[PDB]
Design a protein around this ligand. Structure first.
Ligand SMILES: [Zn+2]
Lengths: 27, 375, 29, 172, 133, 130, 191
């Protein structure tokens, strides 16, 4: 449970930031 | 779970680590998952685990319960310490396959493990697969950023393979590379001496090793100056500065090693070639014409095969030029550059000094006589 | 989702930046 | 005091960039900019490094960098201009100054104005003033007032670029 | 007031080389850029550096200045050691002479309105055969 | 070993020059110091992020009268053949000065005042030999 | 407050320890996340950087206001080598020196989870330099307390001088993840 929740935290945060940045750049 | 119980049991059950088992169990209980790796290496390097299944049990229990997270290279190092005293030369390969599967992220670790598999496989035979392992590990090793402790083990494996296969020249190359990769003061004096001997014999017996410099100047070979075997250094010096006279004087010594006795003829041809090369290098271009009588008074051969000596010298690519045997002379126009000594570099410095004096003299003359037409 | 998303977005960004690159190429005669 | 044509460079100082290294938190940088007897204190050593930034490049004619008259006053004032990066009290001791003033009690007094080499200060955006020694020798230095007298250089304030004539479609 | 017939636009070596390179790096399209410099007093305009501007389709006009680009690069130049002004704009005329035509006057009017001393430099990189700039 | 080469500035500035001209990608770095420094290897490691083949050109501002002002280096780590302990050090790469025609037109004009005739006058040739 | 902070991360191989669940790596990850978001929650214009004290220091993100990129480049930090506290703190000082808005007070929040193989004299000298240069160091001391907490205490006391509340030293005894203490700590309590 803890490992999966940590993975979800990392995914959500980092991936969302990366998508936002790269979407802004491609825009 | 069970590791705590095993640790408290081995506190006194198993040998050694009387009071150090205490701190080891303390470290695990603290779940530092490290610094216990350091002490583990420090201990398994102790003079107590060379024939004991206790270390195999140690592996099973806590390495199974602990390998999930450790410095993969350090994990592989302790796995090597485990394997070295497990004598199933058919199950050791399976074990090393298993540990490679375990460690998938450290390119360093996988290279080290494949070197270990090669070491055991070659210890048991299967040279045709050991060579493949060497090749692929080298291909995967010239892809990391630079040099690491993995390189030492790889070049050690390659050197051992080349010694078993008898390719002396390749062994010489690989052994020098390994002595470079690994520190020297770390090694014990005995290992330094053994490696120096092996490198020396490999260089002396070689199908292309003529640059014995880089070894006469190594701190490695600074393990035989006063040892009973100063002989090898003396012979190596003679080889570097081909001294067939000194070689035949030391003929009393290299006979002791059977292999050199076996390959006498190759040895003499190589020393002869080095003698010619040294002559040509020493002589300046003004009178670099070498006479057959000069060669014969040098490396001891009568003048009807000096032609063949110069033939082989030119063929091997060591000395360029031509032979004009109507007047019995050899025009050497080139020489295989080699590694010199400090005295030879001082000789070159003196010659540069003279050359500079000449250049400056002509410089001043021209500038003084053309003073009115220099823009 | 991340693998495909970032793969396609890398494709798209590379294509866009290469379009900018091409926008500064002069033809020949 | 103020020769006609030159004006005090207060209004062109923006707090976005002003700073003063090695200052005692009790007495801040706002003290030196009131004309009242509110001072600035040195924190650790008998040294100080002020830095002032201007919105538009300015020309500096004179400086009014004065302190009390109790032995706690600036002695050696090294002035650098237009520094790309905030410097340290180790570079301030070797860097060649654009000016190397050595203040005296006359300048320190409330009626003292120190004139600089005008030419070297014809375009100033940032000024760093290193007080290296105190008037006598005091572990703490104190500055009572500091303001520059000069003229502003006419500014080509980009981001004001706009169509002053024509349509919005002409290319060439 | 008047502009004396001794005024000189001292174009530095770096500025000249950048201008010629950017001209023959975009011929036969036109190219534009700014000229960071310094208005010394009334007879001098020192062009210390030049400043390429991305090609933006609309030839070289007021809309071709790209305020975000110029502002951000001016800040970056400021912090790398170029706290300089913007004294005018250069724009190449690829092979058809060194003068102005309509949009150039409009743009230069914009620059003058910003600050009424900004020069406008025109370089013909095709006619700039080696030995004559 | 304490230095602050600013990679954010590097990236932004390279973005702007990529917009200006695109057929030019980061190919290393330069520093105007007459000799190398200890930091140089670390700085090269930093710049290797943006170009694996990094070329450090030590452009000597001071005008010497005998040699080119550029000396170029590239980082190499490899097991030495002679067995001497290996460390990350620089290796020389031949350097030259050359120019596009768009820059020859400029250098020629700037140097026309103190130019040397592009023809062999006997005095000039004797000067060349001296 | 208008302040610029330089989060120093110890990526030493000692971060492999699991004495701070799940591992010290993720403990530091969470700590940095929380501290960066708190600095943002302060007056937003304030800025946060990122340094790593590997075998030799390295700078991950020069001062930028958007914490997303700091966190993104933090996620890939991996355990390698040992720590160099003095070099790290001086490089952080250089990073502060190159700060766009000079108003921002200089702070350095350093996670010191490793034995600091430095000398007390050097540490006090560096503390004196930072004290003169107006730098406030907040040390998160978690790990080899007895080995180095003495040197860190001397460092922070020198920084504080006699009333220099700017520099702080929070020692976290082994326990839960390395955030609960931080969310209520003098360095962050005011923030
Ligand atoms: Zn036009």
């Amino acid at each position: 449970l803890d490992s999966e929740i940590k993975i979800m935290k990392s995914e959500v945060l980092r991936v969302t930031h990366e998508l936002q940045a790269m979407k802004d750049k491609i825009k | 779970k069970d590791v705590p119980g095993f640790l408290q049991q081995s506190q006194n059950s198993g040998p050694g680590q009387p009071a150090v088992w205490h701190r080891l169990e303390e470290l695990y209980t603290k779940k530092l998952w490290h610094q216990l790796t350091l002490q583990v290496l420090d201990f398994v390097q102790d003079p107590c685990f060379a024939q004991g299944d206790g270390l195999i049990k140690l592996y099973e229990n806590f390495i199974s319960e602990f390998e999930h997270r450790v410095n993969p290279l350090s994990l592989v190092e302790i796995i090597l310490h485990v394997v070295r005293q497990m004598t199933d030369p058919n199950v050791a390969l399976t074990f090393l396959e298993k540990t490679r599967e375990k460690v998938k992220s450290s390119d360093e670790a996988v290279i080290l493990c494949k070197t270990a598999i090669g070491a055991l496989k070659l210890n048991i035979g299967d040279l045709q697969v050991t060579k493949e392992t060497i090749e692929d590990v080298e291909e995967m090793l010239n892809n990391l950023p630079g040099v690491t402790s993995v390189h030492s083990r790889f070049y050690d494996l390659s050197s051992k393979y080349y010694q078993t296969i008898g390719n002396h020249a390749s062994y010489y190359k690989d052994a020098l590379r390994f002595l470079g990769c690994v520190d020297i003061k770390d090694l014990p004096v005995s290992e330094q001496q053994e490696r120096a001997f092996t490198l020396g014999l490999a260089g002396l017996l070689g199908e292309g090793v003529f640059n014995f410099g880089e070894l006469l100047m190594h701190p490695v070979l600074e393990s035989l100056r006063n040892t009973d075997r100063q002989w090898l250094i003396d012979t190596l010096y003679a080889f570097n500065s081909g001294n067939v006279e000194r070689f035949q004087t030391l003929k009393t010594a290299w006979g002791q090693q059977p292999d050199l006795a076996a390959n006498e003829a190759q040895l003499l041809r190589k020393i002869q070639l080095l003698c010619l090369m040294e002559m040509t290098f020493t002589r300046p271009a003004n009178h670099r014409q070498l006479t057959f009588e000069e060669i014969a008074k040098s490396a001891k051969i009568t003048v009807n095969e000096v032609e063949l000596l110069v033939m082989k010298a030119l063929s091997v690519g060591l000395v360029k030029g031509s032979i004009d045997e109507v007047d019995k002379r050899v025009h050497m126009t080139w020489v295989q550059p080699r590694v010199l000594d400090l005295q030879q570099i001082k000789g070159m410095k003196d010659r540069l000094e003279f050359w500079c004096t000449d250049v400056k003299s002509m410089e001043m003359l021209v500038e003084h006589q053309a003073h009115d037409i220099l823009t | 989702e991340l693998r495909e998303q970032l793969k396609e977005l890398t494709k798209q960004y590379e294509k866009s930046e290469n379009d900018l690159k091409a926008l500064q190429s002069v033809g020949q005669i | 005091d103020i020769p006609k044509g030159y004006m005090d460079l207060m209004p062109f100082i923006n707090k976005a960039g002003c700073e003063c290294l090695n200052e005692s938190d009790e007495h801040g940088f706002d003290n030196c900019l009131r004309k009242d007897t509110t001072f600035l204190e040195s924190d650790c050593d008998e040294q100080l490094l002020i830095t002032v930034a201007f919105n538009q490049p300015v020309k500096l004619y004179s400086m009014k960098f004065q302190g009390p008259d109790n032995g706690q006053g600036p002695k050696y004032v090294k002035i650098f201009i237009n520094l790309p990066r905030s410097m340290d009290f180790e570079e301030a001791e070797r860097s060649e100054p654009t000016q190397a003033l050595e203040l005296t009690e006359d300048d320190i007094k409330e009626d003292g104005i120190v004139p600089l080499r005008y030419v070297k200060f014809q375009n100033v955006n940032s000024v760093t003033i290193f007080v290296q020694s105190n008037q006598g020798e005091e572990e703490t230095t104190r500055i009572s007032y500091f303001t520059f007298i000069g003229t502003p250089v006419q500014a080509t304030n980009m981001n004001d670029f706009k169509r002053v004539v024509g349509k919005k479609g002409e290319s060439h | 007031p008047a502009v004396d017939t001794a005024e000189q636009v001292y174009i530095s070596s770096l500025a000249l080389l950048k201008m010629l390179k950017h001209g023959r790096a975009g011929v036969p399209m036109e190219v534009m850029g700014l000229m960071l410099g310094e208005f010394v007093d009334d007879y001098t305009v020192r062009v210390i550096d030049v400043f390429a501007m991305p090609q933006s389709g609309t030839g070289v006009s007021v809309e071709a200045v790209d305020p975000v680009f110029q502002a951000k690069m001016l800040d970056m130049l400021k912090q790398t050691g170029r706290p300089e002004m913007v004294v005018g704009w250069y724009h190449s005329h690829p092979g058809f002479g060194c003068w102005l035509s309509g949009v150039d006057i409009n743009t230069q009017q914009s620059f003058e309105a910003l600050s009424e001393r900004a020069v406008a430099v025109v370089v013909d990189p095709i006619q700039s055969v080696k030995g004559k700039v | 070993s304490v230095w602050f080469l600013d990679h954010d500035y590097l990236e932004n500035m390279y973005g702007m020059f990529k917009k200006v001209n695109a057929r030019e990608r980061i190919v290393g770095w330069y520093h105007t110091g007459p000799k190398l420094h200890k930091n140089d290897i670390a700085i090269n490691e930093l710049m290797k992020r943006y170009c694996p083949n990094s070329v450090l050109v030590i452009i000597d501002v001071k005008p010497k009268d005998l040699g080119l002002p550029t000396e170029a280096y590239i980082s190499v780590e490899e097991v030495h053949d002679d067995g001497t302990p290996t460390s990350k050090t620089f290796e020389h790469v031949t350097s030259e000065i050359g120019a596009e025609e768009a820059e020859e037109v400029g250098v020629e004009h700037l140097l026309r005042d103190i130019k040397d005739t592009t023809v062999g006058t006997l005095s000039q040739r004797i000067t060349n030999q001296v | 407050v208008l302040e610029s902070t330089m989060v120093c991360v110890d990526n030493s191989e000692y971060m492999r320890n699991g004495d701070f669940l799940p591992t010290r790596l993720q403990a530091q990850q969470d700590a940095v996340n929380i501290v960066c978001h708190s600095k943002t929650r302060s007056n937003p214009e304030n800025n946060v950087g990122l340094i790593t004290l590997a075998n030799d220091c390295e700078v991950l993100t020069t001062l930028t206001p958007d914490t997303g990129r700091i966190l993104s480049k933090l996620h890939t930090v991996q355990p390698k080598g040992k720590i160099t506290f003095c070099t790290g703190i001086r490089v952080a000082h250089l990073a502060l020196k190159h700060r766009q808005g000079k108003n921002h007070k200089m702070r350095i929040i350093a996670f010191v989870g490793s034995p600091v193989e430095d000398n007390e004299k050097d540490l006090v000298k560096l503390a004196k330099r930072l004290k003169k240069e107006k730098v406030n160091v907040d040390i998160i001391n978690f790990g080899e307390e007895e080995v180095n907490t003495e040197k860190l205490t001397a460092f922070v006391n020198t920084l504080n001088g006699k009333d220099g509340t700017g520099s702080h030293l929070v020692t976290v005894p082994p326990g839960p993840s390395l955030a609960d203490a931080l969310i209520s700590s003098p360095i962050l309590a005011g923030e």
